[PDB]
């Protein structure tokens, strides 16, 4: 993943 | 060749993220629009302010080709008078649009096992875009009363978010490549015609 879940462009993960 | 460079538009290796939608100017060339309109690959081919059948009989001063990736179920937002995250915060067509919206399923190129998270959309914005505005800013979005200090936190969000394109997604959740052609009439000579 390009960011950890909840960070960056992965906020909704 | 006098042929308009639609090859490059439709065969480009990279497509833009929708928030950073790409515009290609098309000028001084001919095209057979029926080669596009008769294609069984375009699941969307919707024109506004002009009939698709008439395109080969028209000339324009310039043509612009805007392109990007969105979900199949967001293609409906790429039309005049629409609302939603994409029309409101990413790519907005005017009421008086003269052009055509073209789209095709790109799951084979744009999804990957484990998900392709490369493509972005703007999820938060303080106001709606004006037609044909492009916002590529990355300010932390302040959703509550506390200032964000340039940092993600509670109520403080990075404004761009990843699509998650997994190959097995339901079809409307799969990626679609979109090309928007806009036909510009000025008080100036035509430069882009049909055959
Ligand atoms: C791998 C991954 N990446 C993003 C951005 N989001 C999720 C849920 N997973």
Residue numbers in the entry:
A (entry chain B): 260 to 265, 273 to 279
B (entry chain A): 333 to 527
Give verbatim excerpts from the published study on this entry:
However, these antibodies work by blocking binding between the human ACE2 cellular receptor and the receptor binding domain (RBD) of Spike (S), which is one of the most rapidly changing virus:host interfaces. The bicyclic peptides described here are structurally and chemically unique, comprising cyclized linear peptides with a symmetric, central small-molecule scaffold that forms covalent thioether bonds with three cysteines encoded in the linear peptide sequence. Rapid screening of diverse bacteriophage libraries against SARS-CoV-2 Spike yielded unique Bicycle binders across the entire protein. Amongst the different epitope groups, only E2 Bicycles were capable of directly competing for hACE2 binding (E2 IC50 of 520 nM).
As expected, both E2 Bicycles bind the same site within RBD; a narrow saddle-like surface adjacent to the hACE2 interface. Superposition with a RBD-hACE2 structure (6M0J39) suggests that E2 may be a direct hACE2 competitor but this is less clear for E2b. Full name of scaffolds: TATA is 1,1’,1”-(1,3,5-triazinane-1,3,5-triyl)triprop-2-en-1-one, also known as triacryloylhexahydro-s-triazine; TATB is 1,3,5-tris(bromoacetyl) hexahydro-1,3,5-triazine; TCMT is 2,4,6-tris(chloromomethyl)-s-triazine.
